[PDB]
Design a binder for this molecule. Structure first.
Ligand SMILES: O=C(O)CCC(=O)C(=O)O
Ligand SMILES: [Fe+2]
Length: 226
């Protein structure tokens, strides 16, 4: 009634850029609205019911690392149009930011990794997303879990910013967008989840680090949506 969305340019330049450059972590709640976030949840639940997910441990393994299942979504597939819209919304924010996030020049991204922690106390041990300079500079995560209560269901993303006297507890709440630097500045872990936990991750590529990267689906650079 009295509420209005912030335009992407404003959110980007007045909040995301300052917050990232000071803290290396930035949370945006109510990113897309209830209607759209509910539609994303249905599409992700469809992918799961219909059996499109692959054990994350298979992807990462050579010791148990991660209890999640996953699938990569390009954005344009049948029953994935709203994930496509999500990805375009993320892209619009980054475009407005680009130039002003450290000295990175972002020239692309991965496809969307839709991930599912199927309850049963599953999670992801402490890790750095990009420890060996594979080109990914920013991790962007969108959560879609209605009425999530970490007291009961756990599933917290805990981030340990390198050499800071602080840490961050990020709850995977419905319609929350999360940005953090993908490198060693931000080791993090998904703590045990006791309900079904959904999340959609995209990583953004720095043009320079990417070009110099040494010889997965994490390695494909798509152009940003217009
Ligand atoms: O779902 C999350 O909160 C983070 C998952 C994660 O860190 C990863 O899959 O690399
Ligand atoms: Fe991660």
């Amino acid at each position: 009634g009295q509420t209005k969305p912030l335009p992407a340019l404003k959110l980007a330049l007045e909040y995301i850029v300052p917050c990232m450059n000071k803290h290396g972590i930035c949370v945006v709640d109510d990113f897309l609205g209830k209607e759209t976030g509910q539609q994303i949840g249905d599409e992700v639940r469809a992918l799961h019911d219909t059996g499109k997910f692959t054990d994350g441990q298979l992807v990462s393994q050579k010791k148990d690392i991660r209890g999640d299942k996953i699938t990569w979504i390009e954005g344009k597939e049948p029953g994935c149009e709203t994930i496509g819209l999500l990805m375009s919304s993320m892209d619009d924010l980054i475009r407005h930011c680009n130039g002003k996030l450290g000295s990175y020049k972002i020239n692309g991204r991965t496809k969307a990794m839709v991930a599912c922690y199927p309850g049963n106390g599953t999670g992801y041990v402490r890790h750095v997303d990009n420890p060996n300079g594979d080109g990914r500079c920013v991790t962007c995560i969108y959560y879609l879990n209605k009425d999530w209560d970490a007291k009961v269901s756990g599933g917290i993303l805990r981030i340990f910013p390198e050499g800071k006297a602080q840490f961050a507890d990020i709850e995977p709440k419905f319609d929350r967008l999360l940005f953090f630097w993908s490198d060693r500045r931000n080791p993090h872990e998904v703590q045990p989840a006791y309900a079904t936990r959904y999340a959609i991750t995209v990583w953004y590529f720095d043009a320079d680090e990417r070009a110099r990267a040494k010889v997965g689906e994490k390695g494909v650079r798509v152009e940003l949506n217009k």
